[PDB]
Amino acid sequence: KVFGRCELAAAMKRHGLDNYRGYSLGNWVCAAKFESNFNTQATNRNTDGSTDYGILQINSRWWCNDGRTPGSRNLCNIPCSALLSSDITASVNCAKKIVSDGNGMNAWVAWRNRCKGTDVQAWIRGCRL
Ligand SMILES: [Cl-]
Ligand code: NA
């Protein structure tokens, strides 16, 4: 599914991401925009042979099992395919473990390069929440 901007903001707020570990809703919407273009079915292969999955491009090296990333961990205890669903629940629950691990949202390269230190409130402007 390809989410609209306000539609995704509303789904993320319902799932407890607004100000989760101090990150306002704008931060999560901006990250999803530059990571996946709001497409739950986005996949991208890394040079090390791991793969990034879903709306927040969660990496098979640490977070999910895809059966083809030898010697990787499965720290969210899910198949990577569960992260491609039109229901964002699994992506959201795994994202909360990632942002809690000590590096905050710096775990998402596109957040660090394209969202951090910008006016992120602009991403939720005009939405009914
Ligand atoms: Cl932080
Ligand atoms: Na893995």
PDB file of C-alpha atoms and ligand atoms in Angstrom:
ATOM      1  CA  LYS A   1       0.000   0.000   0.000  1.00  0.00           C
ATOM      2  CA  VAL A   2       1.209   3.592  -0.795  1.00  0.00           C
ATOM      3  CA  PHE A   3       0.041   5.815   2.146  1.00  0.00           C
ATOM      4  CA  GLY A   4      -1.034   9.438   1.865  1.00  0.00           C
ATOM      5  CA  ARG A   5       0.956  11.846   4.131  1.00  0.00           C
ATOM      6  CA  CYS A   6      -1.928  12.633   6.616  1.00  0.00           C
ATOM      7  CA  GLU A   7      -3.242   9.036   6.434  1.00  0.00           C
ATOM      8  CA  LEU A   8       0.190   7.741   7.592  1.00  0.00           C
ATOM      9  CA  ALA A   9       0.591  10.470  10.329  1.00  0.00           C
ATOM     10  CA  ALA A  10      -2.821   9.331  11.721  1.00  0.00           C
ATOM     11  CA  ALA A  11      -1.888   5.575  11.613  1.00  0.00           C
ATOM     12  CA  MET A  12       1.486   6.303  13.351  1.00  0.00           C
ATOM     13  CA  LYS A  13      -0.178   8.462  16.072  1.00  0.00           C
ATOM     14  CA  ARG A  14      -2.742   5.621  16.763  1.00  0.00           C
ATOM     15  CA  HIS A  15       0.227   3.179  17.153  1.00  0.00           C
ATOM     16  CA  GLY A  16       2.008   5.346  19.887  1.00  0.00           C
ATOM     17  CA  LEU A  17       4.885   6.965  17.812  1.00  0.00           C
ATOM     18  CA  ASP A  18       3.954  10.655  18.610  1.00  0.00           C
ATOM     19  CA  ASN A  19       6.797  11.836  20.958  1.00  0.00           C
ATOM     20  CA  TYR A  20       8.011   8.152  21.385  1.00  0.00           C
ATOM     21  CA  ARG A  21      11.517   8.499  23.095  1.00  0.00           C
ATOM     22  CA  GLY A  22      11.069  12.283  22.522  1.00  0.00           C
ATOM     23  CA  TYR A  23      10.638  12.135  18.655  1.00  0.00           C
ATOM     24  CA  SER A  24       7.609  14.222  17.495  1.00  0.00           C
ATOM     25  CA  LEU A  25       5.309  12.730  14.793  1.00  0.00           C
ATOM     26  CA  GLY A  26       6.887  14.938  12.030  1.00  0.00           C
ATOM     27  CA  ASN A  27      10.242  13.018  12.467  1.00  0.00           C
ATOM     28  CA  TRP A  28       8.609   9.564  11.762  1.00  0.00           C
ATOM     29  CA  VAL A  29       6.626  10.880   8.709  1.00  0.00           C
ATOM     30  CA  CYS A  30       9.781  12.543   7.225  1.00  0.00           C
ATOM     31  CA  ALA A  31      11.822   9.275   7.755  1.00  0.00           C
ATOM     32  CA  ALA A  32       9.093   7.133   6.037  1.00  0.00           C
ATOM     33  CA  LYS A  33       8.924   9.661   3.128  1.00  0.00           C
ATOM     34  CA  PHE A  34      12.698   9.510   2.274  1.00  0.00           C
ATOM     35  CA  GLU A  35      13.149   5.782   3.238  1.00  0.00           C
ATOM     36  CA  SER A  36      10.230   4.243   1.206  1.00  0.00           C
ATOM     37  CA  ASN A  37       8.215   7.113  -0.416  1.00  0.00           C
ATOM     38  CA  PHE A  38       5.331   5.882   1.887  1.00  0.00           C
ATOM     39  CA  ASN A  39       5.229   2.412   0.115  1.00  0.00           C
ATOM     40  CA  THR A  40       4.857  -0.581   2.530  1.00  0.00           C
ATOM     41  CA  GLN A  41       6.262  -2.955  -0.233  1.00  0.00           C
ATOM     42  CA  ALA A  42       9.693  -1.163  -0.680  1.00  0.00           C
ATOM     43  CA  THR A  43      12.799  -3.477  -0.626  1.00  0.00           C
ATOM     44  CA  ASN A  44      16.469  -2.482  -1.182  1.00  0.00           C
ATOM     45  CA  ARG A  45      19.591  -4.788  -1.183  1.00  0.00           C
ATOM     46  CA  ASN A  46      22.759  -3.609   0.735  1.00  0.00           C
ATOM     47  CA  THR A  47      26.430  -4.336  -0.392  1.00  0.00           C
ATOM     48  CA  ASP A  48      26.912  -6.752   2.591  1.00  0.00           C
ATOM     49  CA  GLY A  49      24.007  -8.905   1.147  1.00  0.00           C
ATOM     50  CA  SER A  50      21.447  -7.852   3.855  1.00  0.00           C
ATOM     51  CA  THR A  51      18.073  -6.345   2.658  1.00  0.00           C
ATOM     52  CA  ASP A  52      15.944  -3.366   3.969  1.00  0.00           C
ATOM     53  CA  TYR A  53      12.136  -3.954   4.192  1.00  0.00           C
ATOM     54  CA  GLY A  54       9.001  -1.828   4.307  1.00  0.00           C
ATOM     55  CA  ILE A  55       7.886   1.729   5.124  1.00  0.00           C
ATOM     56  CA  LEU A  56      10.893   2.275   7.486  1.00  0.00           C
ATOM     57  CA  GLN A  57      13.453   0.104   5.566  1.00  0.00           C
ATOM     58  CA  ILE A  58      14.302  -2.151   8.537  1.00  0.00           C
ATOM     59  CA  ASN A  59      17.570  -4.147   7.930  1.00  0.00           C
ATOM     60  CA  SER A  60      17.718  -8.057   7.895  1.00  0.00           C
ATOM     61  CA  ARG A  61      21.341  -7.856   9.306  1.00  0.00           C
ATOM     62  CA  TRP A  62      19.922  -7.193  12.847  1.00  0.00           C
ATOM     63  CA  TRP A  63      16.133  -6.924  13.063  1.00  0.00           C
ATOM     64  CA  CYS A  64      14.207  -9.591  10.992  1.00  0.00           C
ATOM     65  CA  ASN A  65      14.751 -13.082   9.417  1.00  0.00           C
ATOM     66  CA  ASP A  66      14.642 -13.316   5.536  1.00  0.00           C
ATOM     67  CA  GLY A  67      16.423 -16.713   5.377  1.00  0.00           C
ATOM     68  CA  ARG A  68      19.250 -15.355   3.220  1.00  0.00           C
ATOM     69  CA  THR A  69      21.424 -13.131   5.515  1.00  0.00           C
ATOM     70  CA  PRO A  70      23.936 -15.649   6.971  1.00  0.00           C
ATOM     71  CA  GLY A  71      25.025 -14.971  10.601  1.00  0.00           C
ATOM     72  CA  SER A  72      22.444 -12.149  11.082  1.00  0.00           C
ATOM     73  CA  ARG A  73      20.282 -11.592  14.219  1.00  0.00           C
ATOM     74  CA  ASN A  74      16.480 -11.432  14.407  1.00  0.00           C
ATOM     75  CA  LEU A  75      16.122  -8.879  17.250  1.00  0.00           C
ATOM     76  CA  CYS A  76      12.415  -8.062  16.423  1.00  0.00           C
ATOM     77  CA  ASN A  77      11.584 -11.841  16.245  1.00  0.00           C
ATOM     78  CA  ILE A  78       9.659 -11.660  12.935  1.00  0.00           C
ATOM     79  CA  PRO A  79       9.926 -12.711   9.323  1.00  0.00           C
ATOM     80  CA  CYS A  80      11.054  -9.650   7.188  1.00  0.00           C
ATOM     81  CA  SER A  81       7.950 -10.292   4.975  1.00  0.00           C
ATOM     82  CA  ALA A  82       5.673  -9.186   7.949  1.00  0.00           C
ATOM     83  CA  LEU A  83       7.226  -5.657   7.452  1.00  0.00           C
ATOM     84  CA  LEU A  84       5.739  -5.316   3.893  1.00  0.00           C
ATOM     85  CA  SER A  85       2.060  -5.592   5.043  1.00  0.00           C
ATOM     86  CA  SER A  86      -0.530  -2.777   4.446  1.00  0.00           C
ATOM     87  CA  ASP A  87      -0.979  -2.987   8.307  1.00  0.00           C
ATOM     88  CA  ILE A  88       2.009  -1.023   9.741  1.00  0.00           C
ATOM     89  CA  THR A  89       1.706  -2.628  13.246  1.00  0.00           C
ATOM     90  CA  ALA A  90       4.790  -4.945  12.869  1.00  0.00           C
ATOM     91  CA  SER A  91       6.972  -2.118  11.356  1.00  0.00           C
ATOM     92  CA  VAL A  92       5.945   0.251  14.229  1.00  0.00           C
ATOM     93  CA  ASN A  93       6.637  -2.329  17.021  1.00  0.00           C
ATOM     94  CA  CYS A  94      10.095  -3.143  15.550  1.00  0.00           C
ATOM     95  CA  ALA A  95      10.900   0.631  15.036  1.00  0.00           C
ATOM     96  CA  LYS A  96      10.261   1.186  18.829  1.00  0.00           C
ATOM     97  CA  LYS A  97      12.971  -1.465  19.656  1.00  0.00           C
ATOM     98  CA  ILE A  98      15.404   0.160  17.163  1.00  0.00           C
ATOM     99  CA  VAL A  99      14.991   3.801  18.404  1.00  0.00           C
ATOM    100  CA  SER A 100      15.326   2.542  22.066  1.00  0.00           C
ATOM    101  CA  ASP A 101      18.757   0.891  21.485  1.00  0.00           C
ATOM    102  CA  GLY A 102      20.926   4.002  22.308  1.00  0.00           C
ATOM    103  CA  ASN A 103      21.370   5.703  18.851  1.00  0.00           C
ATOM    104  CA  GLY A 104      17.786   7.148  18.589  1.00  0.00           C
ATOM    105  CA  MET A 105      16.695   7.955  14.985  1.00  0.00           C
ATOM    106  CA  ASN A 106      20.380   8.145  13.757  1.00  0.00           C
ATOM    107  CA  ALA A 107      19.735   4.411  12.865  1.00  0.00           C
ATOM    108  CA  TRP A 108      17.864   5.771   9.717  1.00  0.00           C
ATOM    109  CA  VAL A 109      20.452   7.273   7.240  1.00  0.00           C
ATOM    110  CA  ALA A 110      17.733   9.286   5.362  1.00  0.00           C
ATOM    111  CA  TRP A 111      16.479  10.751   8.722  1.00  0.00           C
ATOM    112  CA  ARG A 112      20.048  11.839   9.667  1.00  0.00           C
ATOM    113  CA  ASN A 113      20.740  13.299   6.149  1.00  0.00           C
ATOM    114  CA  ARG A 114      17.289  14.729   5.171  1.00  0.00           C
ATOM    115  CA  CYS A 115      15.127  15.260   8.355  1.00  0.00           C
ATOM    116  CA  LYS A 116      17.417  15.939  11.376  1.00  0.00           C
ATOM    117  CA  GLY A 117      17.627  19.729  12.146  1.00  0.00           C
ATOM    118  CA  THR A 118      14.882  20.622   9.564  1.00  0.00           C
ATOM    119  CA  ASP A 119      11.336  21.966  10.269  1.00  0.00           C
ATOM    120  CA  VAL A 120       9.779  18.407  10.597  1.00  0.00           C
ATOM    121  CA  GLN A 121       6.400  19.833  11.849  1.00  0.00           C
ATOM    122  CA  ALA A 122       5.797  20.803   8.135  1.00  0.00           C
ATOM    123  CA  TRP A 123       5.238  17.012   7.451  1.00  0.00           C
ATOM    124  CA  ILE A 124       2.012  16.976   9.638  1.00  0.00           C
ATOM    125  CA  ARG A 125       0.764  20.536   8.600  1.00  0.00           C
ATOM    126  CA  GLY A 126      -2.955  20.540   7.552  1.00  0.00           C
ATOM    127  CA  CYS A 127      -3.673  16.928   8.804  1.00  0.00           C
ATOM    128  CA  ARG A 128      -6.675  16.110  11.083  1.00  0.00           C
ATOM    129  CA  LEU A 129      -5.137  14.212  14.068  1.00  0.00           C
TER     130      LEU A 129
HETATM  131 CL    CL B   1      17.615  10.252  21.290  1.00  0.00          CL
HETATM  132 NA    NA B   2      18.349 -11.453  10.180  1.00  0.00          NA
END
